[PDB]
């Protein structure tokens, strides 16, 4: 499964993470 989780704490809630989840 594609991993959309933030790589580290400073990417929690990041636009990239949110977008990643949005297109799964």
């Amino acid at each position, epitope marked *: 499964i594609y991993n959309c989780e933030p*790589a*580290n*704490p*400073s*990417e*929690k*809630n*990041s*636009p*990239s993470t949110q977008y990643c989840y949005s297109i799964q």
Partner: antibody
Amino acid sequence: QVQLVQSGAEVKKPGSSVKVSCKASGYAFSYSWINWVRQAPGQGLEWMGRIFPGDGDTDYNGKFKGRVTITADKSTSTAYMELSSLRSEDTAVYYCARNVFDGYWLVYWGQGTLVTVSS
Amino acid sequence: DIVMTQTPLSLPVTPGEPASISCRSSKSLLHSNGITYLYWYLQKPGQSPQLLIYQMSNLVSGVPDRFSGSGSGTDFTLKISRVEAEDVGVYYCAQNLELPYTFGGGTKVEIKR
């Protein structure tokens, strides 16, 4: 233009609690983590905690044994750090800093607030 | 917690010559994604900290090209190819791989004369 403007220097008595402000502008206040980092003399930089103002989510450094409270006021785009039961070793310059997503981390810093603990 | 340690404590530098400062972490800052979560900040005299290098080797746009960063997962170097007077201040390395975020003790760069 991203700006983080903090409250002025504060003298606090031992055992008291200080509230330091960080007024943000030039970006979406709700959607970046605001971090608090202090610089005590003879010490480097030490992380205190952070808040995501959009949902109020926080993380704290365990080292401060629950003495730190970080909050946000969306009406004024202001983040706050409160530190209770102040001791002389809490004398430090307290900075707020905005995390910039996509790997940059702490790009934007406030000017710092000197808190001096003394009787 | 991840402990960040720097050397030397103090570094007199000569404008026009190279300078290097070192950092190490108690745990590897290498993520499976290939990125190393090591950052370099500089606090110039009377100023707030600024970010110079993110993720070990990436220069923030606007930072002079004389600065560079490299290292392994646990040991890091900030290099100034040719020092300028405006490069003085306290340099801090830091990690954001894990909470709590942690910083090195700092290296204070001053002018050698």
